Design a protein around this nucleic acid. Structure first.
Length: 1323
RNA sequence: AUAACUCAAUUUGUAAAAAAGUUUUAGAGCUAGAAAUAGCAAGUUAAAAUAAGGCUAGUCCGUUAUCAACUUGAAAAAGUG
DNA sequence: CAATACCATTTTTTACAAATTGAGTTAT
DNA sequence: AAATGGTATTG
C-alpha cells in the first residue's frame, strides 16, 4: 500500500518520483486511449514536466502605458483642430483633411498631395523660407505681422505634439542675460565674508566656461583653473558645483558631523539648506542666494545656446543655429573632400549602405555611427582643424530632432506657444478667446494618483467622478473627484490590520503609531545599580518622565543619554547598567519633533483633547504628495494655526504605512482593567507586558477579541504569493502533478511528500555603480585604466574596480595585470555560508591576509582597514550588509552559536516561498479531523535544500551531467524522496526542522556529520536502524544498488507542457514596401505593397485541416490535409467561426469534426520510436531523449573534471582505464542520431572532428563529448562546437511527416496517454 | 516556526510623463544622352501610424497569469484509466 | 527540395503599495 | 539578452 513522493521544483521543470518502502520506484500498466492498436503500456513512476518560463507583467504594462500615451497625444491635436475648425474652414476647408491623409500615396488621396497649401508653388516656397519647423516657430513668436492660420496651427501643434518633460514644478523664465554678472554677484558676496583669501575674479569668462560644449562636472575644473589659489573640492568650488547640479560632501568646509550634500534642483533643498545654516549662521545664506541667481541662467545652458535678449524663442533659435552650422560645415566638407579625397566623395554622400553622410541622413546610421565612420577621414585631411574639435564636443552635423532633446522641459515649448498666441490674438479673436484653452492642452497631464479616466470598464482604474460627463483638460478639476481618487490610489494598495482585519493600518509616521513603538521597546528595558538584588522594570511614572524629557527633546535618545540625562540627573545613580536597548532606541518620536519644530507649541502636541486632529494631519500628509491637495484638506485646521506654519506644514510630507490599526493600538479594551494595549504599554505594574504578550495573555480579553474579528481557489491562491511569476508557475504545476500522482496511486495519499526548489543588463548596473562610486571617491582610476561595460562581468576585474584598485585586507595597491596571481576570499567563508554574490566576495593579493580561515576577518584587519571600508560604504562600492560582515570580529566575531546556525541553514530551508508550497501541500493532503476535533496528519511534507542530494550524488558517485538529457530533474526528485524519507526514519528528532507543522559545538558537530549514517567509514555497519523503534533506514549493501538501478532506468516520463502562444502579434519592425504576401497591413486600408508593414507573426496554434482546394482554370476540387498556423492576430476570428475563416483561406468542404488544436510542443511519434514536437505550423523540434547508461555518465563526469585525496588515484585511474568508453559513447550518439535526429551532414562532421582530435587529453575529449549532446538534446536544434569545428543547427522545416504520424496526447505526468493515428483521418 | 520595531538590499504589481526609432507622403532636382548611363546639385524638416482592432464608446480595453485527451460546463472546474 | 545566412523597437523620468533576506532589540 | 522561428537567397 504505502508510498512516498519526491518533487524537484524549478522554473522550467518539476521532477517527480514515486518510491515505496525499499526506496524502489514502482512500475505499472496504464490504459492507452484513441485509435492505435496499442490498448496499454508499462510506465516507471519517475518523470518530469518541462515548460517555457512564465513571465513578469512588466513588458505588458510598459506597452499598455505607451498605448495610453498614444491615444492621449492624438486627442491633444484633436482638441486643437476642434478650436481651429470653424476659422480654418474659412481660410482653407481641407487643410486638416490632408494632414490626416499625408501618409497615403498620391493615388489614394482625396486632396492635392501638397499638405500645407494644397499646391506645389506655395509649398516649395514655404520649405526654402522655413527649412525647419523651428525657423517658423521663431518667426511666429518674434514677428508682429498677421500670420497664416495654417502656419499658426502647425507651430502650435508641433509644440503641443512634442511638448517636452514634466519634471520641473511651476513657472520658468530664460535669464542667460547675465551668466557673466550673476556669477560676479557670487564672488563679491563670498569676497565680503572670506575677506582673508579674496578670490581674484576679473570676471574672465563666467559666461563661456560654465556653459561650454563639454560637460557640467568638467566645466567646474575649468573655472577653478582660471581662479588661482582654490581647491575645486573647496568652499568656492562647492558653491559652483551646486550652481551646476553636482552634490559636494560639504562637511570638510565647516568641521561637521556627517557628509552634508545638497542639490539646488531637489524640493528637499528649501528645508535642507536650513539644516546647514543652523550650523554656520543665517549670515551666509547670501552665498546660497547668489548660488541660485547663477544656478537659474546655467540650468538650461546645455539646450538653449542663444543670448535670449534678441528673441523670445531661444529654443527654436538654438535649433536654427544647429541647422545653419550643419549647412556651413557640410558645404565645407563637400569642398574639402573634392579638393583632397575626390575618390571617397561618392561613398560618403551617395552610398547609404556605408555610415557616411548619406548613411546618416537617408540610411539608418546614428549621430554616433556617423562620427565614428568619418573621424578617420576628417584627420587624414588638413582642413578639419576646427571641424574635428566640433565632432568631439558632439556639435558636428547635428539634426534638430535627436536622442538628447530628452532635457527640454515642457515650460520651454510653452514659452514659444504662449508667445505666438500673444502675437496672433491681436488679429484672430478666437485665439484671444481660447488662448487659455489651447495652453491647457500643452500643460494638462493626468496625475499619477488618478490613473486611467475610465468609466466602469478598466480593471486598472480607481478614479471617482463628482459627475458623469466627458473629461477634458478644461473640466478635469470640476468632473474628477481628485481627493477621493488621490486617496484610493493609496488605500486600494495598503494593508488591513491582520489582527482587526476590517481596520486599515495607521500611517508609519502617525503620532499614535510612534508612541506605541517606544513604549513597546521601553516597557522591556531594565536597569541596575549596586544595592539592587535583581535588575527591575521601568515603572509607569518612570517611562513617562523618560518619554516627556528625552524622547520629546531628541529625535534619537542614546543609551548614554538615558544613563546620564535621566538616572544621574534625576535618579542619582552615578553608575547604572541597563538591558534591552543596545546602543540607541530603535523607536523614536520622529513625528513629535518634525511637528514641534514647525508647529512651534508643546502645550498643543502634549494635549490629549486634540488627538483625533493631529492623527488626521499625519493621515493627510501620508496619503497625499500634491502640496496643493494637502493645503486644501489642511485648510479646515486654519483657525487652530498661525499662517506662517501652514507654509511649513503643507510641505511636511510623510511616506510609509504601519502594520497595525488605531482600534488595536488604543481603541479596543481589556474587559477587566478597561485599558487599551497602549495603556498597558504605558503602565503594567511589575509585569511590563509587550504588545505580543498582551495579545497572547489569557488573563486579558485581547486574545479572544482578536479571535472573534478573524475571517476565512488554488489558481488564485498561488498567484497571490510573493515570488517571481516564473517560480509561481513551477509551484502551481507541482500541486497538479501531486494531484495526478495521488490518482495513479488509487486515491491513497502518500506517507510523505519531499519538496525542494532552486535559486548588458547587469553590465550597465555595474559600470553605473563603478562610475558613481569613484566619481564620489574622486579617484583618477578610470582615466588611468578605462573600461567598457561588459568585461566588468569578470568578477576579478569588477571587484578590483569596486576596491579602487587596492587590496581589501592589507592597504597595498593591486597590480591590474596580476589578477591571475590573486585570490577571491569569501568574507563569511564558504565552510559556513554558500553565498557567491559580490556581497560576500573580496579581492586580495593572498586570501591569508584575512588571517584565520575558521572565522570572519581578524580584529587586526578590521581596525587597520575599517576607515577605507566606510570610504567604499559611502561610495556604494560595498553595501551596509558587506561592511557589517567585514567588521564582525570587533563586535565579538562569529560565535560558535552563529556558526552552528550557518551549517543548520545549509540543510533546513528558510525561504518563505518554499514554506508556502509545503503549507499548500500539507493543507491540501491533511483535511480530516478526529473525534476530539484536532487535524489528523495523514501526510508529512518534508522540505530539503538542494545541497543534501548534490552532496549525496558526489559522495556515492550518482553524478549528473545536466547536458545529457532532461532525466536529471526526475533523478533529483527520486534522490530527494529517498534522502528525505531515510533522514526522518533515522532521526525523528529532525521532523521539527524538515516536516511542516559547548551547546553550539555539539549541534554544529551533529549537523556537519548528520548524513554519515549513509557512509561505512568515518566504524558503522551495513544495516542501519532507528535506535528507539528499530525500523530499517538503509541496507547499505543492497540499497545504493536500488538507487543505481532507478538512475539506470531508460524509461523516464518527460513531458513538455503544450502551450497556446500569446503576446505580441509579430516582430514590431515597420518594414518598407516590397511585393511579398508576408507583409501585414498596419491599418485595414494600408496595402503593404504600397506602405510596408510587418513580416513575422507568431502562430498562436496550428490546426489540422482536412478539406479540398480549387486547382487550375477549371477550379477542379482536390483533397488536402495540412497544418494551418492560426496567428495570434487571426485567432479570435478563427475561434468565432471556425469554418467561414478556413473557407475565406481557400479550403472547401472543410470536415469540421476532424479539426485538431495543435499548440506549440504537441508531440508526434513517427517510425523507429522517433518523435517530433510541433514548434509551429511549418517547423518541428527534436522529440526524443537520449538515455545514456549510468556507466558512461560517470566516466564523462570524472573525465570532464580531472581537476577534482587518496581517492583521486582510484577516481583518476578509472578514467585512463576506460579510454575506450569514448568510442562506445560516440557510437551511442551515432545509433541515436542516425535513428531519430536524421542530420546526415552534421553527424559526418562530428564523426570526423572526433576521430581528428583522438590524440588529445581524455579531459579535453570529455568536455567536448558533453558539447555533442546538443546534437541529440530534446528541443529546437541549436549550434555547438566540437573543439574548433562548429556544427550549425540542422532544422526541421516541414510538418508534412506528422500528418500521417501518431499524435500522442500526454497527461501532466505522462502516465495517461491518448494516441491518435493521423493516417486514419485524411479522407 | 511567529509578531512589532531598526537599518540596508532585493523582488513584485500599478499609474502618469518624456525623447528617439521605423513606416508612407510632402519638401519641382539640373544638364548631356535614343537608351544604358554619366556629370553635378541637394540632404538637417513635417505630417500621419505605432500592435490589426474591439464595444462596453471610456481621453476605455487590446502582449502578464491560466491551457493534455475524452464526457460535462459560457466559464471556472468536475467526472474518466 | 537542402544548406546557408540574417534578423529580432530603444532609451528616459516621476509617484506609490506590498513582500522578502538578513544584520540587530523585545517577545508568543 | 539569447534563442529560434520567419524570411529570403542560393545551389
Amino acid at each position: 500500500k504505502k508510498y512516498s513522493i519526491g518533487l524537484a521544483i524549478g522554473t522550467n521543470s518539476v521532477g517527480w518520483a514515486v518510491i515505496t518502502d525499499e526506496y524502489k520506484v514502482p512500475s505499472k500498466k496504464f490504459k492507452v486511449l484513441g485509435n492505435t492498436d496499442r490498448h496499454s503500456i508499462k510506465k516507471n513512476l519517475i518523470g518530469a514536466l518541462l515548460f517555457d518560463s512564465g513571465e513578469t507583467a512588466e513588458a505588458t504594462r510598459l506597452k499598455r502605458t505607451a498605448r495610453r500615451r498614444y491615444t492621449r497625444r492624438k486627442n491633444r491635436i484633436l482638441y486643437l483642430q476642434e478650436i481651429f475648425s470653424n476659422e480654418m474652414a474659412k481660410v482653407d476647408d481641407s487643410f486638416f483633411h490632408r494632414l490626416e491623409e499625408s501618409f497615403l500615396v498620391e493615388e489614394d488621396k482625396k486632396h492635392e498631395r501638397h499638405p500645407i497649401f494644397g499646391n506645389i508653388v506655395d509649398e516649395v516656397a514655404y520649405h526654402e523660407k522655413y527649412p525647419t519647423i523651428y525657423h517658423l516657430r521663431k518667426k511666429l513668436v518674434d514677428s508682429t505681422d498677421k500670420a497664416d492660420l495654417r502656419l499658426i496651427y502647425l507651430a502650435l501643434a508641433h509644440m503641443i505634439k512634442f511638448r517636452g518633460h514634466f519634471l520641473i514644478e511651476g513657472d520658468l523664465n530664460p535669464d542667460n542675460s547675465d551668466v557673466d554678472k550673476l556669477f560676479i554677484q557670487l564672488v563679491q558676496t563670498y569676497n565680503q565674508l572670506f575677506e582673508e583669501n579674496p578670490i581674484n575674479a576679473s570676471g574672465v569668462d563666467a559666461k563661456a566656461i560654465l556653459s561650454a560644449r563639454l560637460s557640467k562636472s568638467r566645466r567646474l575644473e575649468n573655472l577653478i583653473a582660471q581662479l588661482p589659489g582654490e581647491k575645486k573640492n573647496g568652499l568656492f568650488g562647492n558653491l559652483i558645483a551646486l550652481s551646476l547640479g553636482l552634490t559636494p560632501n560639504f562637511k570638510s568646509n565647516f568641521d561637521l558631523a556627517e557628509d552634508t550634500k545638497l542639490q539646488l534642483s531637489k524640493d528637499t533643498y528649501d528645508d535642507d539648506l536650513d539644516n546647514l545654516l543652523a550650523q554656520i549662521g543665517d549670515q551666509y545664506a547670501d552665498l546660497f542666494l547668489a548660488a541660485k541667481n547663477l544656478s537659474d541662467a546655467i540650468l538650461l545652458s546645455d539646450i538653449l545656446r542663444v543670448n535670449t535678449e534678441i528673441t523670445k524663442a531661444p529654443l527654436s533659435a538654438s535649433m536654427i543655429k544647429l541647422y545653419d552650422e550643419h549647412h556651413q560645415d557640410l558645404t565645407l566638407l563637400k569642398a574639402l573632400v573634392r579638393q583632397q579625397l575626390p575618390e571617397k566623395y561618392k561613398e560618403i554622400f551617395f552610398d547609404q549602405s556605408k555610415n557616411g553622410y548619406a548613411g546618416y541622413i537617408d540610411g539608418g546610421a546614428s549621430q554616433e555611427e556617423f562620427y565614428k565612420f568619418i573621424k578617420p577621414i576628417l584627420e587624414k585631411m588638413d582642413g578639419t582643424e576646427e571641424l574635428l574639435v566640433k565632432l568631439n564636443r558632439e556639435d558636428l552635423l547635428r539634426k534638430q530632432r535627436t536622442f538628447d532633446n530628452g532635457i527640454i522641459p515642457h515650460q520651454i515649448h510653452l514659452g514659444e506657444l504662449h508667445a505666438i498666441l500673444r502675437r496672433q490674438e491681436d488679429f484672430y479673436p478666437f485665439l484671444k478667446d481660447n488662448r487659455e484653452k489651447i495652453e491647457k492642452i500643452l500643460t494638462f497631464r493626468i496625475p499619477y494618483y488618478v490613473g486611467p479616466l475610465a468609466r466602469g470598464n478598466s480593471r486598472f482604474a480607481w478614479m471617482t467622478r463628482k459627475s458623469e460627463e466627458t473629461i477634458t483638460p478644461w473640466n478635469f478639476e470640476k468632473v474628477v473627484d481628485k481627493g477621493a481618487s488621490a486617496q484610493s490610489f493609496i488605500e486600494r494598495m495598503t494593508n488591513f490590520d491582520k489582527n482587526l482585519p476590517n481596520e486599515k493600518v495607521l500611517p508609519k509616521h502617525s503620532l499614535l503609531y510612534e508612541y506605541f513603538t517606544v513604549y513597546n521597546e521601553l516597557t522591556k528595558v531594565k536597569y541596575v545599580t549596586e544595592g539592587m538584588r535583581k535588575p527591575a522594570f521601568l515603572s509607569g511614572d518612570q517611562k513617562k518622565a523618560i518619554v516627556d524629557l528625552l524622547f520629546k527633546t531628541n529625535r534619537k535618545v542614546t543609551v548614554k543619554q538615558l544613563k546620564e540625562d535621566y538616572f544621574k540627573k534625576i535618579e542619582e545613580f552615578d553608575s547604572v547598567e541597563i538591558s534591552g536597548v543596545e546602543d540607541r532606541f530603535n523607536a523614536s518620536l520622529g513625528t513629535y519633533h518634525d511637528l514641534l519644530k514647525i508647529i512651534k507649541d508643546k502645550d498643543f502636541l502634549d494635549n490629549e483633547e486634540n488627538e483625533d486632529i493631529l492623527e488626521d494631519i499625519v493621515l493627510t500628509l501620508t496619503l497625499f504628495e500634491d502640496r496643493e491637495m494637502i493645503e486644501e484638506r489642511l485648510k479646515t485646521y486654519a483657525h487652530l494655526f498661525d499662517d506662517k506654519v501652514m507654509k511649513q506644514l503643507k510641505r511636511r510630507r510623510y511616506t510609509g504605512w504601519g502594520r497595525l490599526s488605531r482600534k488595536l493600538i488604543n481603541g479596543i479594551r481589556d474587559k477587566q482593567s478597561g485599558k487599551t494595549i497602549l495603556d498597558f504599554l504605558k503602565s503594567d505594574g511589575f509585569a511590563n507586558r509587550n504588545f505580543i504578550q498582551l495579545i497572547h495573555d489569557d488573563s486579558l480579553t485581547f486574545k479572544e477579541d482578536i479571535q472573534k474579528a478573524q475571517v476565512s481557489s488554488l489558481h488564485e491562491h498561488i498567484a497571490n504569493l510573493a515570488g517571481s511569476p516564473a517560480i509561481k508557475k513551477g509551484i502551481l504545476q507541482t500541486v497538479k502533478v501531486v494531484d495526478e500522482l495521488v490518482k495513479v496511486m488509487g486515491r491513497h495519499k502518500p506517507e510523505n511528500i519531499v519538496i525542494e526548489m532552486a535559486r548588458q543588463k547587469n553590465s550597465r548596473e555595474r559600470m553605473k555603480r563603478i562610475e558613481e562610486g569613484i566619481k564620489e571617491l574622486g579617484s583618477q582610476i578610470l582615466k588611468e585604466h578605462p573600461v567598457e561595460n561588459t568585461q566588468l562581468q569578470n568578477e576579478k576585474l569588477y571587484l578590483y574596480y569596486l576596491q579602487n584598485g587596492r587590496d581589501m585586507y592589507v592597504d597595498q595597491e593591486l597590480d591590474i595585470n596580476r589578477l591571475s596571481d590573486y585570490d577571491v576570499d569569501a568574507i563569511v567563508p564558504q565552510s559556513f555560508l554558500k553565498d557567491d554574490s559580490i556581497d560576500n566576495k573580496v579581492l586580495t593579493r593572498s586570501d591569508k591576509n584575512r588571517g584565520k580561515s575558521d572565522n570572519v576577518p581578524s580584529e587586526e584587519v578590521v581596525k587597520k582597514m575599517k576607515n577605507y571600508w566606510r570610504q567604499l560604504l559611502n561610495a556604494k562600492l560595498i553595501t551596509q550588509r558587506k561592511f557589517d560582515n567585514l567588521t564582525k570580529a570587533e563586535r565579538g566575531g562569529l560565535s560558535e552559536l552563529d556558526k552552528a546556525g550557518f551549517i543548520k541553514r545549509q540543510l533546513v530551508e528558510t525561504r518563505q516561498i518554499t514554506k508556502h508550497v509545503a503549507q499548500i501541500l500539507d493543507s491540501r493532503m491533511n483535511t480530516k479531523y478526529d473525534e476530539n476535533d484536532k487535524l489528523i496528519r495523514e501526510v508529512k511534507v518534508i522540505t530539503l535544500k538542494s545541497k543534501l542530494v548534490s552532496d549525496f550524488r558526489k559522495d556515492f558517485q550518482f553524478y549528473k551531467v545536466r547536458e545529457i538529457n532532461n532525466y536529471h530533474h526526475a533523478h533529483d526528485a527520486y534522490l530527494n524522496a529517498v534522502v528525505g524519507t531515510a533522514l526522518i526514519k533515522k532521526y525523528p528528532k529532525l521532523e521539527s526542522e524538515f516536516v511542516y507543522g559547548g551547546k553550539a559545538t555539539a549541534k554544529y558537530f551533529f549537523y556537519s556529520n548528520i548524513m554519515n549514517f549513509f557512509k561505512t567509514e568515518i566504524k558503522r555497519p551495513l544495516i542501519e536502524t532507528n535506535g528507539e523503534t528499530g525500523e530499517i533506514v538503509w541496507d547499505k549493501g543492497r540499497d545504493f544498488a536500488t538507487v543505481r538501478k532507478v538512475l539506470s532506468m531508460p524509461q523516464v516520463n518527460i513531458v513538455k507542457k503544450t502551450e497556446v502562444q500569446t503576446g505580441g502579434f509579430s516582430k514590431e519592425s515597420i518594414l518598407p514596401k516590397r511585393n511579398s504576401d508576408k507583409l501585414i497591413a498596419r491599418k485595414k486600408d494600408w496595402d503593404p505593397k504600397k506602405y510596408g508593414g510587418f513580416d513575422s507573426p507568431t502562430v498562436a496554434y496550428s490546426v489540422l485541416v482536412v478539406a479540398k482546394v480549387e486547382k487550375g482554370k477549371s477550379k477542379k476540387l482536390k483533397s488536402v490535409k495540412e497544418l494551418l498556423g492560426i496567428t495570434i492576430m487571426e485567432r479570435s476570428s478563427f475561434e468565432k467561426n471556425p469554418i467561414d475563416f478556413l473557407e475565406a483561406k481557400g479550403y472547401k468542404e472543410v470536415k469540421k469534426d476532424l479539426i485538431i488544436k495543435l499548440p506549440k510542443y504537441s508531440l508526434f511519434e513517427l517510425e523507429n520510436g522517433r518523435k517530433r514536437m510541433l514548434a509551429s505550423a511549418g517547423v518541428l523540434q527534436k522529440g526524443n531523449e537520449l538515455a545514456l547508461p549510468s556507466k558512461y555518465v560517470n566516466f564523462l563526469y570524472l573525465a570532464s573534471h580531472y581537476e577534482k585525496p587518496e581517492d583521486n588515484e582510484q577516481k583518476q585511474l578509472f578514467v585512463e582505464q576506460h579510454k575506450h568508453y569514448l568510442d562506445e559513447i560516440i557510437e551511442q550518439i551515432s545509433e541515436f542520431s542516425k535513428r531519430v535526429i536524421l542530420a546526415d551532414a552534421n553527424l559526418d562532421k562530428v564523426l570526423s572532428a572526433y576521430n581528428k582530435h583522438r590524440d588529445k587529453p581524455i579531459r579535453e575529449q570529455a568536455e567536448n563529448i558533453i558539447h555533442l549532446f546538443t546534437l541529440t538534446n530534446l528541443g529546437a536544434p541549436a549550434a555547438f562546437k566540437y573543439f574548433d569545428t562548429t556544427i550549425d543547427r540542422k532544422r526541421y522545416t516541414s510538418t508534412k511527416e506528422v500528418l500521417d504520424a501518431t499524435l500522442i496526447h500526454q497527461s501532466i505526468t505522462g502516465l495517461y496517454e491518448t494516441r491518435i493515428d493521423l493516417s486514419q483521418l485524411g479522407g
